[PDB]
Amino acid sequence: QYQMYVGGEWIDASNGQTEPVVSPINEEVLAYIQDADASDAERVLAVATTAQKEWAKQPARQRAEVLRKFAQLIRDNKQYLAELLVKEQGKLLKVALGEVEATSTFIEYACDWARQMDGDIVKSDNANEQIMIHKIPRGVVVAITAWNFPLALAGRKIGPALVAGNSIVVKPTSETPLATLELGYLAEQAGIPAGVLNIVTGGGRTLGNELVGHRMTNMVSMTGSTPAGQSIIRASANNMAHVQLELGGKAPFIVMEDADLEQAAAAALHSRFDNCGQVCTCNERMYVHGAVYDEFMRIFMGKVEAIKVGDPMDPASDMGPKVNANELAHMEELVAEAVDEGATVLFGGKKLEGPEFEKGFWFEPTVLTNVTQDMTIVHEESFGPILPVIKFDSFDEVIEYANDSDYGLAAMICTQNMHYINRLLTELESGEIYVNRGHGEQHQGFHNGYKLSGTGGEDGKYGFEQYLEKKTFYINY
Amino acid sequence: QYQMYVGGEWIDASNGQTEPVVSPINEEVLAYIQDADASDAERVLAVATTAQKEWAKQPARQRAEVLRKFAQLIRDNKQYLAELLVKEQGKLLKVALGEVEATSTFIEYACDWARQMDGDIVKSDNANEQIMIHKIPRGVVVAITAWNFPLALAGRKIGPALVAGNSIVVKPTSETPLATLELGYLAEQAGIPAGVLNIVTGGGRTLGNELVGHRMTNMVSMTGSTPAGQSIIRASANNMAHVQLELGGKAPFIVMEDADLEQAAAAALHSRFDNCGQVCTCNERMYVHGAVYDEFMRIFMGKVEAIKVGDPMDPASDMGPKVNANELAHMEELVAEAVDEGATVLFGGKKLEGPEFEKGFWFEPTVLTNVTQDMTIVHEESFGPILPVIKFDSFDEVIEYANDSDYGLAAMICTQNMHYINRLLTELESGEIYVNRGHGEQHQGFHNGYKLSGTGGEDGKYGFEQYLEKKTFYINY
Numbered sequence: 001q002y003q004m005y006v007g008g009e010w011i012d013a014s015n016g017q018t019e020p021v022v023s024p025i026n027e028e029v030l031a032y033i034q035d036a037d038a039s040d041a042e043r044v045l046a047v048a049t050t051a052q053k054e055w056a057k058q059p060a061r062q063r064a065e066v067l068r069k070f071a072q073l074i075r076d077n078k079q080y081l082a083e084l085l086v087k088e089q090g091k092l093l094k095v096a097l098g099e100v101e102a103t104s105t106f107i108e109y110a111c112d113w114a115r116q117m118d119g120d121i122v123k124s125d126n127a128n129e130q131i132m133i134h135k136i137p138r139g140v141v142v143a144i145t146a147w148n149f150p151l152a153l154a155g156r157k158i159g160p161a162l163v164a165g166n167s168i169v170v171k172p173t174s175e176t177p178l179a180t181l182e183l184g185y186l187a188e189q190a191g192i193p194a195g196v197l198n199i200v201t202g203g204g205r206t207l208g209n210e211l212v213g214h215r216m217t218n219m220v221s222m223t224g225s226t227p228a229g230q231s232i233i234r235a236s237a238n239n240m241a242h243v244q245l246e247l248g249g250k251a252p253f254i255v256m257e258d259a260d261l262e263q264a265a266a267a268a269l270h271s272r273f274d275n276c277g278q279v280c281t282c283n284e285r286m287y288v289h290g291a292v293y294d295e296f297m298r299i300f301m302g303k304v305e306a307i308k309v310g311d312p313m314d315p316a317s318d319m320g321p322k323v324n325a326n327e328l329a330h331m332e333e334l335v336a337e338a339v340d341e342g343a344t345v346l347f348g349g350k351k352l353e354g355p356e357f358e359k360g361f362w363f364e365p366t367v368l369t370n371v372t373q374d375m376t377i378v379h380e381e382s383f384g385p386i387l388p389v390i391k392f393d394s395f396d397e398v399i400e401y402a403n404d405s406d407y408g409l410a411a412m413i414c415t416q417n418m419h420y421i422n423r424l425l426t427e428l429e430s431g432e433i434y435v436n437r438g439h440g441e442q443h444q445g446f447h448n449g450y451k452l453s454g455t456g457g458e459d460g461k462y463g464f465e466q467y468l469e470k471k472t473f474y475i476n477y
Numbered sequence: 478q479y480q481m482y483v484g485g486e487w488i489d490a491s492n493g494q495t496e497p498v499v500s501p502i503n504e505e506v507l508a509y510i511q512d513a514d515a516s517d518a519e520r521v522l523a524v525a526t527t528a529q530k531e532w533a534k535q536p537a538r539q540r541a542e543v544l545r546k547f548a549q550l551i552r553d554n555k556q557y558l559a560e561l562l563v564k565e566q567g568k569l570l571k572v573a574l575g576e577v578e579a580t581s582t583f584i585e586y587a588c589d590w591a592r593q594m595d596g597d598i599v600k601s602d603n604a605n606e607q608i609m610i611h612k613i614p615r616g617v618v619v620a621i622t623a624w625n626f627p628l629a630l631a632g633r634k635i636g637p638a639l640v641a642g643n644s645i646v647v648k649p650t651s652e653t654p655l656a657t658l659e660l661g662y663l664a665e666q667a668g669i670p671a672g673v674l675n676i677v678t679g680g681g682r683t684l685g686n687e688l689v690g691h692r693m694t695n696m697v698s699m700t701g702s703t704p705a706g707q708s709i710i711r712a713s714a715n716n717m718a719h720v721q722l723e724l725g726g727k728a729p730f731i732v733m734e735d736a737d738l739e740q741a742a743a744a745a746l747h748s749r750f751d752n753c754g755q756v757c758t759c760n761e762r763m764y765v766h767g768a769v770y771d772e773f774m775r776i777f778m779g780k781v782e783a784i785k786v787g788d789p790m791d792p793a794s795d796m797g798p799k800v801n802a803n804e805l806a807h808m809e810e811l812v813a814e815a816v817d818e819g820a821t822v823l824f825g826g827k828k829l830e831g832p833e834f835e836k837g838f839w840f841e842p843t844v845l846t847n848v849t850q851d852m853t854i855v856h857e858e859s860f861g862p863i864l865p866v867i868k869f870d871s872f873d874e875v876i877e878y879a880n881d882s883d884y885g886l887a888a889m890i891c892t893q894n895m896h897y898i899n900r901l902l903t904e905l906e907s908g909e910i911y912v913n914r915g916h917g918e919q920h921q922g923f924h925n926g927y928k929l930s931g932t933g934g935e936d937g938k939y940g941f942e943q944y945l946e947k948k949t950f951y952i953n954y
Contacts, residue, residue, distance in 0.1 A: 237708075
């Protein structure tokens, strides 16, 4: 029976409600969590506010010292945390180990920024006057994390928020919170002061909505769905919290006529099927040039046929289960909707059958061909192992397709043509573009989406900057 | 009878409506303007969208050449435009000459930035890979300007927006929009391509709301009331536009025991009474140390008593009229409520009576004493010539008073104690701090408020930054 980590203590939701956490592998109950509502918001935000006053006054060098310790403790417990992620969320073991490591590196990359939170000395138009733009903490950050990579998403936000001198309240999704809650203990083993790092669980429209719109909240950093994000933006009207969101995506993977086909098929394969399609940057729609279609597809389909779906703890598995039943059902709906709209199911399209799959949420890798740009599958985010393939004949045409979307997070292209690549800068409306390579970003880049994929951007110089506020001084002598 | 500047043309509102623009000086009707509703928002945003694709193709150095021409054209017509601002808005002529000048220098400061729009080349963790973060235009910026400085605020937004490669749609407040509309003709003379700069007038709840919420809007930059800003934030849930708002303010003016009293009283004088109190950074509440109280107030009240209210075209005037009858009524409400709460009107508190003040909206310079920190006048923005004074005995006491606010933009303090001044960095919850001087920001600073004073921040390096999107590349070789 997990509790919440608040102000250095472990406590119950005051509404006394609990909830099981269920494994997508076999539907067993792994544990129970609190299911708090809006009555617990004021209390946790209040301890965060109070702990932040003293935490902010520490030299940044000392805050980074504490968090580097925190980061290493996570790595110490890598094997435990990774298997816990595999069970509660259903990613492959090797992928979970990658996520725990990324949780540590996210905090470590932010710790590099400690003595580089430079403010500006600006030249005044008046003699004997200084202008000073300082960088300071905002105050209290609320972090909302998703079930695709719950633990790494916590690291991605805890790191920057804390190094910058804020305190944080993390609300991991109730679908996959356990590994995240386990950080609570690691925080105390690291000596993060009581109240500076808080972890709570509850209802999205109750506890969540109360947190993000609250007057004690200065910033909301969140990953999830576009509608959930729009709700947070409305909520932020109440407090004028800075809002940083990573939301929906419908990334095009584009194979140009002069691409290295073997490289492109490999990059496209994993960009769609990594984490069972549950990545914000996934190849969600593939465009293949008609001069290379047949050859590209013998290669690509050769790789798809070899994807072994199975138990994520089993090293032989190339793909695990979908996260829950609603998301499984959604696979079936989209595939049925596509066939009905005239699509060809080239491979897959079914729940796995077999007595090994009587329990759990399992879907075949799926390739949909003879697809046209106006079909729903080319527009709606599947977030699962469903990939539609569209032919095109020229660069201008595929750029049109690519920008035909309410999303603009990631995109991938394969080509040898400098000029195509150069034109992407002004012509392709996606914020994170991969060339001759599949997805997967780095702590030091900028994870930024256009249109309805989010606000603010995450990671790197510009990401970290958002956890800071500015204070400007005009001083006259 | 003014029209709307859209797509290089002058057009009527589609709803056929018009309204008068009325002078606060003598209630004269100066001209008529279009009073468009929501049906004109899409058309405007769509021509601005179309015009920006072509504007972004003009290299930055060339866009800045165009806009420096525009800004000079503005200075050529300085006298015409200033005099028009005195009539429609009611500020003193010298202040209007100042405002026209600032409209230019805002645009010229933006132009300084034309070739300093650098992107970042980031080191990869991968052997043969380039990570590139480019800076590109957002697209279409909606600018909403307030009736305190309608022309300067347009320059404040037009410059950054257009230099960075955006197109803009300016909606000046219907109270004072004439001088802003006159930019339409100067834009054509300057060679600003049709559609890159559009000026429309209409209703807040209809035209204004439709613009800020629209899918074609990428950024909203607005000055005005806190509620009007919250409304903009809510609407941006629909489009996820970046939102840059300057809103309410309740700036404290703190006189310490060791302040230069004659310096402080003068700083405090113009910081409250500039522009008839109608400044976002105004001295809205004065805290005076008990030890210097009697001497400071004798000095300060000598300056208040010498303020001459009258015709803003007359060089002899020190203060002009309030913007309109509602705002005038509000001053009466605020002073009446202060008396009801136990306060003392030490000077002023009445409308001007005289043959010169029959027509027009005139309130005396007003100073309230015997006020306590809980009185309404200490917490609600007056935005007019009303100043409460509170005694305090220590630095810790007045910091609490200062931070007891829902606003956090400006703040002024007078002291010789550099230790007090340093403590403000961590202890004063205001974004713009003036030491031993009065308010008045510069284009290279960062005009940035906490709490309910707004979001994003304006001016300078970080203000210019917001008119830009990033686009990340991961290129593999």
